Design goal:
- The structure is cut from a larger assembly and holds 2 copies of chain A (7 residues), 1 copy of chain B (105 residues), 2 copies of chain C and 1 copy of chain D (96 residues).
- Chain B is 6% helix and 22% strand.
- Chain B has 105 residues and is mostly beta strands.
- Chain B is globular and about 55 Å long.
- In chain C, helix 20 packs parallel to helix 22.
- Chain C is 75% helix and 0% strand.
- Chain C has 573 residues and is an all-alpha fold.
- Chain D has one domain: Potassium Channel Kv1.1, Chain A (2-Layer Sandwich).
- In chain D, a hairpin with a 5-residue loop joins strand 1 and strand 2.
- The interface between B and D is medium-sized, with 24 and 33 residues.
- The complex binds zinc ion (ZN).
- Zinc ion sits at the interface of chains C and E.
- Chain D: It is found in: Nucleus.
- Chain D: One of its GO terms (cellular component) is cytosol.
- Chain D: Keywords: Host-virus interaction, Nucleus, Transcription, Transcription regulation, Ubl conjugation, Ubl conjugation pathway.
- Chain D: Belongs to the SKP1 family.
Chain lengths: 7, 105, 573, 96, 571, 7
């Protein structure tokens, strides 16, 4: 994936 | 602003008086209602003469305990001819006592 | 074996079947018998006959005295609210109406009304009807603020302690500070008479309030105050509440070493006195899952929430705010756990259940939606990316955008423009606009999130780290800005390794992006050494896959009360 | 400016005339042949309304008149459970 | 803030003391009992209210407050949404009372019938026709046990209402029997020299024969009903006869008289009843039917939504009267937003129609067929307008099973050779056209056309519509342009004869012929039909400047006798 | 579209 998990 | 129920025998005068106003104005407001001079009448907060000099706030008629929802009663006698009479304040009525559903029967 | 039924349970069925002709006489029964008739009415499915007798306050007061069979009473009450009858509001209004009449009455009648109000408000707060438990507790306070005597200050400060719990849970944070100020005024009135009430519960409720408004600096101070105020004579529920709120305040300031001890002791106390099938044990389980999710122990956090939700679906019923909070907490944990796997089937099912309950029981302009919605608005995003279609992707991203806008509007209306929750919503919107290919809007939202969060939290805070990680992912993969992405990736990596060590899960999502960056710009030595770093990270990640269940990790009597508290207090120096 | 709301028992609840016209039925009773100013106060007979409920009615008159167009939050009128049914029929009959 | 009245405060105090004064409320005046029960509804105590309303002694006194009946319809319905079957319990209680008092004099029987008539009228106004039919059957038995003049009048007035509750319940086979009983009682009435007016009964029979798609007999009994309208009829009777007369005129292709009939009906309903009355909503629903069938679809959505918003207010959710408003608004939104492709509001209404009808009626009920048909039409157009072939197959299969269920229901109830089963045949043909099954599509369209031309003459609107559908199947799919051209010419001729050059359905035939000739040649024909289509578009844009239809109804345009007399003079 | 509306 590109970005981290949604906060 | 204090609300009262000036009951004598079976009448119940529903009057409103200022908190700072004295008992003499409370006796004089009956002049326009029952047309009897304030000299020949005295008030009664549960067997307590209410003299002209002392104010309504001094004799326990605070606006918290005599709100319009449940005004505080005050007795009255009209001296008859020369000697005052006892408080003959008759109770209103007994509402139909609804039975308690939790009472064992 | 076919054991014949007890004459009690056989006569209960005969009484229920003859319910109509013997309804008045049932109210004149012992409390243990009378509750069992109503529980049999619920079991037989005759909710309307049961609900017509739970609406009366005095009849419901006797079934509230059966403290043993309260887990059944909660389930009956939740069945009644799902039935259609609004017993929670009817009982609250009945208590307030019958309470305003005996304001001027004697001390015994007012004491009885106060006790009935405490038991009813405690039930309605335990069941989750905070808007209805507030009216009961408001009427109890109105009784307490009549005579300025000794015990009335104690009962009024207890009322104000219970008003924070039914206002923090109802998201009435504006009235929470006023209630705390009133309670502190009454504690000062007590102190003027040479008597000090125990302030642990009030300070724990205020810590919950300040954590809810994202005031972690003040929340940590007030939980320190609450833990200093814990004595040996406190009830188990009060010390459990204080311990779990102090754990939630410690984990959000990233004092994980103290938060783990506090929450493990809270879970142990909840499992001892209350059991494994109690609402308070489930609350401690939710806070334990919050801890585990914040400390990169997500696989155990999912199982902890799954254990927490299963208690709330058994004690309570269907459309309940406690079941809804368990669903929205489990939906987010399953989301973060299955983020790499992509199996957002249970996470979406749990997030949809949470919204399907909160919308039914709360107004559309309520703050508790802003959590549930955004959780769905995360999962709906990741399903949109995983879906190969463009039509379904566009529809899901538009739905997630609507949900994120609604949640951001709710958070702005409740807290303000400069809150941490608003920063979280801005970061989520930035991620979504990155997914929606609106790169300029994503950059603006991420910059707004950084500006809001940097001043509120620390300069090198964990939330700032993950948000600069999101912004670096946007700059690297999408906006092809190859220097700002580098510096933000380095910041995120540094904060992650400073806080969680080398086992932080976001480290891989930073390293892969940074390797892609360097492959885009060159410096193959950097690419080689970061491949080595990623291999080492994978090694430490597979080594730390012990994932032993945290339910038994709290063990049996590892320490005791006023030892975890004492350790937490002494560690503050 | 005073009217004498005589109940069934005989209690003479002397309330201000401005308060009594809150109820439509008392306003109707004080119109027509009933507005004849006998004595100074108009004696209104309520042979079907007892005293324990007419007192609550007069209290409601002095409550609504005082608390009309109130800026602050208004408290509910205290109606006891034993009086509630008899004061329900008296509130309908008096149209107050 | 203002102080709440002593009446409402006392009601709040009595309700709060409900357990201690539950039986003492039943001794209150009938205008206080309903206010107490409405407070029980408002407070959320639906269980206590449901327990009280399930007793006929309590509910009869509630029904005597006709001022706040709109408040009762939303309480009762809430109880029926609460899960308590108040309607069936009340019908059973009335049947038990009638069976108990069958052996009595004619004094208490007349009292029970009058209580029976108000209860049956409430149960049929709320939409519980299967539960109102039992009450009216008991009333009819009471009126049948004796054969005096007043009992004959009551038996006729009860077979009028029994016919109405057997029309909205889709029991069209018992409607003929009920009308025969009413006709027998009326003949026995006229034998003794006393004549009962036949407007309401003939209007109900008109609705029966229209719902069976017997439009010729429906119009005949329409004329017979309007021949029996006097100046002394109740406004409800005149309104019902006007509505059913307008519907019969519409389906007889006589829009010139249907317009005045239905506009006068809407005016009468809005005048006597009000803008928030169930009968006004029924008039709006039939007015939307009129507007939808006269190529005025854009206003019809504004009428059905007006009709539905009245029915959601007085009744609430999970009601057949709301369900009919939904399934009619869903079809009108489907027709209006057809070329636009925005079947979002249309499907949302059709979902609620099935979601309500499935809850309150059995799976084998005809009213579920019409709600399934509309949602199957909407699902088909959502299917062909999407891009996912998986969706294009799943939605098409859902529409297929919905259409087959609706066809089975219509075939079981009406028969093989009715108009309403031919409509399902035509819809199935359109569905098979969309679903790339053409051999069955041609058969379905052939069956629909043959049934609708055997019954509805040769140049009707419905047969023209099915001819246009079959012609689009031949043109765009089978490339049999020789037949498709002939069918397009037939459809264009019928549409021009019925709706004129401003017909909005002529675009699908003009473009069809344009593509037909582009496929085969005759570019002079392409040019001529292209300029004809341009002229049609210009005329449609000129005519598109429409107004609100409620304003078109206006206030006091006509008089009651004038409209009936004009209709009768115009045959 | 290719054909008229449904009936
Ligand atoms: Zn119920």
């Amino acid at each position: 994936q590109k970005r981290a998990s949604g906060q | 602003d204090v609300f009262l129920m000036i009951r004598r025998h079976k009448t119940t005068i529903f009057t409103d008086a200022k908190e700072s106003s004295t008992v003499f104005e409370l006796k004089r407001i009956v002049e326009g209602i029952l047309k009897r001079p304030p000299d020949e009448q005295r008030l009664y907060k549960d067997d307590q003469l209410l003299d002209d000099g002392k104010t309504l706030g001094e004799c326990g008629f605070t606006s918290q305990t005599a709100r319009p929802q449940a005004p505080a009663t005050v007795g009255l006698a009209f001296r008859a001819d020369d000697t005052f009479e006892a408080l003959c304040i008759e109770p209103f009525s007994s509402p139909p006592e609804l039975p308690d559903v939790m009472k064992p029967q | 074996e076919w054991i014949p039924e007890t004459l009690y349970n056989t006569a209960i069925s005969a009484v229920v079947d003859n319910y109509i002709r013997s309804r008045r006489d049932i109210r004149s029964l012992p409390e243990n018998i009378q509750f069992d008739v109503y529980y049999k009415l619920y079991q037989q499915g005759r909710l309307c006959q049961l609900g017509s007798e739970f609406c009366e306050l005095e009849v419901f007061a006797k079934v509230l005295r059966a403290l043993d069979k309260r887990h059944l009473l909660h389930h009956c009450f939740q069945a009644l609210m799902d039935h259609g009858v609004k017993v929670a509001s009817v009982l609250a209004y009945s208590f307030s109406r019958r309470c305003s009449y005996i304001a001027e009455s004697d001390a015994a009648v007012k004491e009885k009304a106060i006790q009935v109000g405490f038991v009813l408000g405690g039930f309605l707060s335990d069941a989750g009807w905070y808007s209805d438990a507030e009216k009961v507790f408001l009427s109890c306070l109105q009784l307490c603020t009549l005579h300025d005597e000794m015990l009335h200050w104690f009962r009024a400060v207890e009322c104000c302690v219970r008003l924070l719990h039914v206002r923090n849970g109802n998201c009435k944070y504006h009235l929470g500070e006023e209630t705390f100020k009133l309670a502190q005024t009454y504690m000062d009135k007590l102190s003027k008479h040479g008597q000090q009430a125990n302030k642990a519960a009030l300070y724990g409720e205020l810590c919950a309030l300040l954590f809810a408004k994202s005031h972690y600096d003040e929340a940590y101070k007030w939980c320190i105050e609450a833990m200093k105020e814990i004595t040996a004579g406190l009830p188990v529920k009060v010390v459990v509440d204080v311990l779990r709120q102090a754990s939630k305040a410690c984990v959000v300031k990233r004092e994980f070493k103290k938060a783990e001890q506090l929450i493990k002791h809270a879970v142990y106390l909840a499992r001892d006195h209350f059991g494994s099938k109690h609402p308070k044990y489930s609350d401690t389980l939710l806070d334990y899952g919050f801890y585990l999710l914040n400390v990169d122990n997500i696989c155990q956090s999912v199982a902890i929430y799954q254990a927490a939700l299963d208690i709330r679906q058994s004690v309570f019923g269907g459309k309940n705010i406690h079941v809804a909070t368990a669903h929205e907490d489990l939906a987010y944990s399953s989301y973060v756990h299955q983020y790499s796997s992509g199996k957002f089937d249970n996470a979406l099912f749990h997030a949809e259940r949470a919204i399907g309950i909160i919308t039914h029981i709360l107004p559309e302009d309520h703050l508790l939606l802003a959590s549930s919605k955004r959780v769905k608005a995360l999962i709906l995003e990741e399903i949109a990316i995983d879906c190969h279609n463009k039509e379904t992707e566009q529809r899901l991203l538009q739905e997630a955008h609507d949900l994120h806008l609604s949640s951001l509007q709710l958070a702005k209306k409740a807290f303000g423009e400069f809150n941490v929750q608003t920063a979280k919503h801005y970061g989520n919107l930035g991620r979504l606009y990155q997914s929606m290919r609106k790169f300029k809007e994503a950059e603006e939202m991420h910059i707004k999130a950084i500006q809001i969060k940097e001043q509120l939290l620390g300069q090198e805070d964990y939330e700032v780290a993950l948000s600069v990680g999101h912004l670096a992912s946007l700059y690297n993969y999408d906006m092809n800005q190859y220097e700002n992405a580098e510096k933000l990736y380095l910041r995120s990596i540094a904060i992650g390794k400073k806080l969680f060590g080398e086992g932080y899960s976001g480290l891989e999502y930073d390293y892969r992006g940074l390797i892609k960056l360097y492959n885009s710009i060159g410096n193959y030595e950097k690419v080689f050494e970061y491949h080595n770093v990623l291999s080492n990270w994978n090694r430490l990640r597979d080594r730390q896959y012990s994932v032993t269940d945290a339910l038994e990790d709290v063990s049996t009597s590892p320490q005791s009360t006023e030892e975890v508290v004492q350790s937490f207090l002494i560690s503050q120096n | 400016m005073y009217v004498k709301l005589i109940s069934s028992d005989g209690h003479e609840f002397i309330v201000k005339r401005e308060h009594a016209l809150t109820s439509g039925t008392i306003k109707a009773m004080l119109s027509g042949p009933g507005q004849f100013a006998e004595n100074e106060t108009n004696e209104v007979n309520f042979r079907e309304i007892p005293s324990h409920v007419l007192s609550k009615v007069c209290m409601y008159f002095t409550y609504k008149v005082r608390y009309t167009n109130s800026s602050t939050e208004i408290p509910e009128f205290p109606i006891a459970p034993e009086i509630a049914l008899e004061l329900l029929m008296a509130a309908n009959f008096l149209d107050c």
